[PDB]
From a paper:
Clinical bedaquiline resistance is primarily caused by mutations in the transcriptional repressor Rv0678 which result in upregulation of the adjacent MmpS5L5 operon. MmpS5 and MmpL5 form a complex that functions as a multidrug efflux pump which confers resistance to bedaquiline and other hydrophobic drugs, as well as exporting the iron-scavenging siderophores mycobactin and carboxymycobactin. MmpS5’s operonic partner, MmpL5, is a 12-TM Hydrophobe-Amphiphile-Efflux 2 (HAE-2) subfamily RND transporter that is evolutionarily divergent from the well-characterized gram-negative HAE-1 efflux pumps. MmpS5 is a small (~15 kDa) single helix transmembrane (TM) protein containing a C-terminal immunoglobulin-like (Ig-like) domain.
To determine the architecture of the MmpS5L5 complex, we purified Mycobacterium tuberculosis (Mtb) MmpS5 and MmpL5 ∆494-688 overexpressed in Mycobacterium smegmatis (Msm) by affinity purification using a C-terminal GFP-FLAG tag on MmpL5 followed by size exclusion chromatography. Cryo-EM single particle analysis revealed both monomeric MmpL5 and a subset of trimeric MmpS5L5 particles. To address preferred orientation, data were collected at 0°, 20°, and 40° tilts, yielding 3.2 Å maps of both monomeric MmpL5 and trimeric MmpS5L5. MmpL5 possesses two periplasmic α+β sandwich fold “porter” domains (PD1 and PD2, respectively), with one present on top of each 6-TM bundle. Our cryo-EM structure resolved the core TM and periplasmic domains but lacked MmpL5’s unique 196 amino acid insertion within periplasmic domain 2 (PD2), which is predicted to form an extended antiparallel coiled-coil with a disulfide bond at the tip. We observed density on the cytoplasmic face of MmpL5, which we assign as the endogenous Msm acyl carrier protein AcpM (MSMEG_4326), since a similar density was observed at the corresponding location in the monomeric cryo-EM structure of the MmpL protein MSMEG_1382 from Msm. AcpM interacts with MmpL5’s basic cytoplasmic Iα2 helix and MmpL5’s unstructured C-terminus (residues 946 to 952), which forms an extended interface with AcpM (Right). A distinct nonprotein density is clearly visible within this cavity in both apo and bedaquiline-saturated trimeric structures, suggesting that molecules can enter this cavity. Crucially, the monomeric MmpL5 structure derived from the same cryo-EM data lacks this kinked TM2 helix and the putative substrate density. This suggests that trimerization induces a specific conformational change that opens this entry cavity, potentially facilitating substrate access from the inner membrane leaflet.
Author numbering:
A (entry chain I): 3 to 80
B (entry chain D): 21 to 493, 688 to 952
The structure:
């Protein structure tokens, strides 16, 4: 489904940016709490999505997204 | 693309044997590079400037040698010198005059009582004599003459309580070359251990750095042999600065080319590529970049414009040829030695854990906030520019050498008693083209000396009026006492046998090579022109030989050759970017970033050097450092933009972070190696080379941490279509499915 595809894309970006395998990446966990992801890493994820695919997450909005669920929902909305 | 590597690697063993045999034949029959530079040097005074014309005409008319080299000798002791010292000095003078192939003429002053006051110090504990050697200052003949004078001095037994050293500008450059040659080996060793210690950290092996040591020393020997061959047959010329900078920059550039090569090799190994594929990907990736950057470092140096001094023309021609030899050595021997040596297991190993993530995270602060970071980087550059209002330069070389050298120690001894700029005189001439041996001409000749005196910092002039140099007034001499042997003893050292060209020996106040001391040259020329105006000397050519005018005429070319290099090197960068990449405006941005960061580099190097350490920047530290900074910053930014182009397929903004992640570790390692190798000049006995190296190293640190890191990619992000416009720009790749 679309959800699986978007989650797989995000997990591939996760593997590229900070080298954690997509296998254990699930939408039932946060970024900083578990994966030790800095605000800059999330910014890199946003830029990668914007470039490779057609999506835009404006500034002063990534902070409001804490869990993978929030990010995937926001992407699906647009 | 798979052809030149297929000729370099398949024939790796025969070409390595060829390199070894050519190095052997260039080192056994053709002398070593040090002796070749000693036998083949270039003038330190101009060849197409008024200063050199002055000395040439002076030699033509005075029959005192057709060159400008002038050395000095100091006899200092614990008490005033007695008659024993005078006898020893007379014997030494006779021995010096006996030699003819080395010394062209003797400007003896201490021997003659009438002018002995002009040699002995105020306290009477020192004296000096001026000799005129063969060949131009800093040339092979001048160095040979300096060595001959030193050997003659050491052959004789000094009287008890007095020691002898050799001073003067020609002796200063000779001892500068001696120090350069002596410290070449220690710089080689220190750089070799620095590369070892950094490879132990970036590659996790010691043999991996032993092979790099072998490669770097082989390349250094190859370039040494090539330059030795080309300078042994009188084809080109060399100098002390040319030789030392060639050697150390060759070591730094060879080790940086190796860093790029085996770092892309390390990246290939991390990506799973084998040896034979890592070799070809390394070539296709960085061999063209190395070629472009070597051609830049060669073309910019060679195109240091046709300047008054060989210290630019023949500092850029042999440097360009040496850099061509070094880039050829890279492109041929490096791949071959790699293919033959890194074919054994457990010799290379990658360390990629903690360096690929901190260069990809900093890359995210360039594309999501391109504005704030770009303006911040430009603000840092402008803050560096903020000290331009208080920028200073110093043309002196005594302050840029250790005190343990014979020349600098003689300067210290002279300064202990003399409080002047005595060891660096200045000569002015006026060709009246008629006999200047009448009373009226002598009365009016002192006008030029007095007019020169009016300028600040020329408080004493050793003119024809009196060697003492005390400015009393315009002397007048009766015609009856005009012609006597005693007066002729000095009149042959002041005016031509018939009288064509005058000489005005001049001693400055304080540092003669300072900004004021060199701005004094224009004032001297204007005063001379005004003095000859309205007098029978009108229409004469005011040629100003010496050292202060030598530096003035040479520094007049600073703007000229800087602009011409900033045209030619940037045009070559244009060509390289259009060939191995596709853009025209970005070929201008890649050099605009560097020229903007030049202000920050200058600010950092003047805060570190002048504000803290209290030492200003030598004029050679301006031109050479700026041009090498342009070339090497262009190398780094060119590697960055080449990687960006290789990663444009996935997007522009994402290409920036991809290139940063993929290139940051290697570029940082190379920049640290280059910076520390250049900073190794701090123990080079050449503090001017230390300033050049430290300035270049700090500029490269600022480039590898700020400019290349954020400033260039921020601009690339802000202007997307205007950065690859000729090749057509789609900022995002055509939208792809998930």
């Amino acid at each position: 489904a679309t959800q699986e595809e978007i989650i797989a894309g995000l997990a591939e970006i996760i593997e590229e940016v900070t080298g954690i395998e997509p296998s254990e990446v699930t939408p039932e966990k946060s970024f900083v709490d578990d994966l030790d992801i800095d605000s800059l890493s999330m910014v890199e994820i946003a830029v990668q999505t914007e470039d490779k695919y057609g999506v835009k997450i404006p500034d002063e909005d990534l902070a409001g997204l804490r869990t993978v669920g929030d990010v995937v929902a926001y992407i699906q909305k647009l | 693309r798979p052809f030149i590597p297929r000729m370099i690697r398949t024939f790796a063993v025969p070409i390595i044997l060829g390199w070894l045999v050519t190095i052997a034949v260039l080192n056994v029959t053709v002398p070593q590079l040090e002796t070749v530079g000693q036998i083949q040097a270039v003038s330190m005074s101009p060849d197409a400037a008024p200063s050199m014309i002055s000395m040439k005409h002076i030699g033509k008319v005075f029959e005192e040698g057709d060159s400008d080299s002038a050395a000095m000798i100091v006899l200092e002791g614990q008490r005033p010198l007695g008659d024993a010292a005078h006898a020893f000095y007379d014997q030494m003078i006779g021995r010096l005059q006996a030699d003819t192939t080395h010394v062209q003429s003797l400007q003896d002053f201490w021997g003659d009582p009438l002018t002995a006051t002009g040699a002995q110090s105020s306290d009477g504990k020192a004296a000096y004599v001026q000799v005129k050697l063969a060949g131009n200052q800093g040339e092979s003949l001048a160095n040979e003459s300096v060595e001959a004078v030193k050997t003659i001095v050491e052959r004789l037994a000094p009287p008890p309580g007095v020691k002898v050293y050799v001073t003067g500008s020609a002796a200063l450059v000779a001892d500068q070359q001696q120090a350069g040659d002596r410290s070449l080996q220690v710089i080689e060793a220190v750089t070799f251990t620095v590369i070892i210690v950094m490879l132990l950290l970036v590659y996790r092996s010691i043999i991996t750095s032993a092979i790099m040591l072998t490669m770097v020393v082989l390349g250094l020997l190859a370039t040494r042999g090539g330059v030795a061959f080309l300078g042994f047959h009188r084809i080109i010329g060399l100098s002390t600065f040319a030789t030392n900078l060639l050697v150390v920059l060759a070591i730094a550039a060879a080790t940086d080319y190796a860093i790029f090569l085996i770092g892309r090799y390390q990246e290939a190994r991390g990506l799973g590529q084998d040896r034979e594929s890592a070799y070809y990907t390394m070539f296709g990736g960085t061999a063209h970049v190395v070629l472009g950057s070597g051609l830049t470092i060669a073309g910019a140096t060679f195109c240091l414009s046709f300047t008054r001094l060989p210290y630019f023309q023949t500092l850029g021609v042999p440097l360009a040829i040496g850099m061509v030899i070094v880039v050829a050595a890279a492109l041929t021997l490096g791949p071959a030695i790699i293919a033959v040596t890194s074919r054994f297991g457990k010799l290379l190993e990658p360390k990629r854990m903690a360096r690929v993530r901190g260069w990809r995270k900093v890359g995210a602060a360039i594309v999501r906030w391109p504005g704030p970071i770009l303006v911040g980087a430009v603000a840092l550059a402008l803050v560096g520019l903020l000290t331009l209002p208080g920028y200073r330069t110093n043309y002196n070389d005594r302050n840029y050498l250790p005190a343990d050298l014979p020349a600098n120690e003689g300067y210290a001894a002279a300064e202990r008693h003399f409080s002047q700029a005595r060891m660096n005189p200045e000569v002015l001439m006026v060709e009246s083209d008629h006999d200047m041996r009448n009373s009226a001409d002598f009365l009016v000749i002192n006008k030029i000396a007095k007019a020169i005196f009016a300028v600040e910092g020329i408080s004493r002039v050793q003119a024809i009026t009196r060697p003492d140099g005390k400015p009393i007034e315009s002397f007048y001499l009766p015609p009856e006492v005009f012609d006597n042997p005693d007066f002729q003893r000095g009149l042959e050292q002041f005016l031509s046998p018939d009288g064509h060209a005058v000489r005005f020996i001049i001693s400055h106040e304080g540092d003669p090579m300072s900004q004021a001391g060199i701005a004094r040259i224009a004032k001297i020329k204007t005063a001379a022109k005004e003095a000859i105006k309205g007098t029978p000397l009108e229409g004469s050519a005011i040629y100003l030989g010496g050292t202060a005018a030598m530096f003035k005429d040479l520094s007049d070319g600073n703007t000229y050759d800087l602009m011409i290099a900033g045209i030619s090197a940037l045009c070559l960068i244009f060509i390289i970017m259009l060939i191995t990449t596709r853009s025209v405006v970005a070929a201008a941005v890649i050099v605009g970033t560097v020229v903007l960061s030049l202000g920050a580099s200058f600010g950092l190097s003047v805060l570190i050097w002048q504000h803290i350490l209290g030492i200003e920047l030598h004029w050679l530290v301006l031109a050479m450092a700026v041009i090498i900074l342009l070339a090497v910053g262009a190398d780094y930014n060119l590697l960055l933009v080449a990687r960006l182009k290789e990663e444009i397929h996935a997007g522009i903004n994402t290409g920036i972070i991809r290139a940063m992640g993929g290139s940051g570790s290697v570029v940082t390692a190379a920049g640290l190696v280059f910076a520390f190798t250049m900073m190794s000049f701090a123990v080079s006995e050449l503090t001017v080379m230390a300033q050049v190296g430290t300035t270049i190293g700090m500029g490269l640190l600022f480039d590898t941490l700020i400019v290349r890191s954020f400033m260039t990619p921020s601009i690339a992000a802000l202007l997307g279509k205007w950065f690859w416009w000729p090749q057509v720009v789609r900022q995002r790749p055509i939208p792809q499915p998930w």
